[PDB]
Amino acid sequence: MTEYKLVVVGACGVGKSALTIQLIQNHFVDEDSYRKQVVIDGETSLLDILDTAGQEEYSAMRDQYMRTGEGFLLVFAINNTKSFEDIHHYREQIKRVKDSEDVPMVLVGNKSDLPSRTVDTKQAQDLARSYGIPFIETSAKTRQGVDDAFYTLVREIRKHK
Numbered sequence: 001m002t003e004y005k006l007v008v009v010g011a012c013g014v015g016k017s018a019l020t021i022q023l024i025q026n027h028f029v030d031e032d033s034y035r036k037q038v039v040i041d042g043e044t045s046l047l048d049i050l051d052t053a054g055q056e057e058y059s060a061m062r063d064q065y066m067r068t069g070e071g072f073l074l075v076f077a078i079n080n081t082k083s084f085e086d087i088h089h090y091r092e093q094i095k096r097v098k099d100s101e102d103v104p105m106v107l108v109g110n111k112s113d114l115p116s117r118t119v120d121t122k123q124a125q126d127l128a129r130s131y132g133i134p135f136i137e138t139s140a141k142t143r144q145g146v147d148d149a150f151y152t153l154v155r156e157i158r159k160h161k
């Protein structure tokens with residue numbers, strides 16, 4: 001059976017855990033590791049997912065997951081300008097550890113249900129275009145875009161392989 005090791009990166013509080021919980025456990029209420037078998041485009045695969053902001057106690061496990069991670073969600077929140085500004089740092093860190101320029105990634109703008117917005121959709125679209133990766137707007141609360149974000153990433157991993 002095909003396994004995909006996924007890593008969800010981004011600033012603290014952007015909703016990495018919430019997105020992963022919604023995907024895996026199908027709920028939201030207002031664990032950093034998750035493991036579930038799903039079916040994506042008719043292919044069964046086990047998703048092994050780590051949520052990380054880079055500042056956790058288990059750095060050794062982080063570096064491992066970064067090296068073995070096959071695909072990365074780069075998550076910011078639409079109401080957190082700093083988290084959007086942090087994205088370039090995260091992508092640069094991934095490129096460094098993978099020692100590669102072609103790493104599957106998706107840019108995720110979370111908390112799309114909230115009326116406070118400080119990051120324009122255009123800004124995020126423009127950034128994703130520059131990186132050559134998809135941008136997906138999500139809400140862990142409403143489930144908007146959640147499957148699409150993770151499944152698009154899995155599709156990016158297949159394209160890479």
Ligand SMILES: Nc1nc2c(ncn2[C@@H]2O[C@H](COP(=O)(O)OP(=O)(O)O)[C@@H](O)[C@H]2O)c(=O)[nH]1
Pocket residue numbers: 010011012013014015016017018019029030051110111112113114138139140141142
């Ligand atoms: N309204 C709303 N709140 C969210 C969303 N995603 C996460 N949250 C809330 O944002 C806070 C931080 O989420 P969390 O998953 O712990 O962020 P993490 O540090 O990136 O893992 C929590 O209070 C969540 O309930 C979302 O899409 N919409």
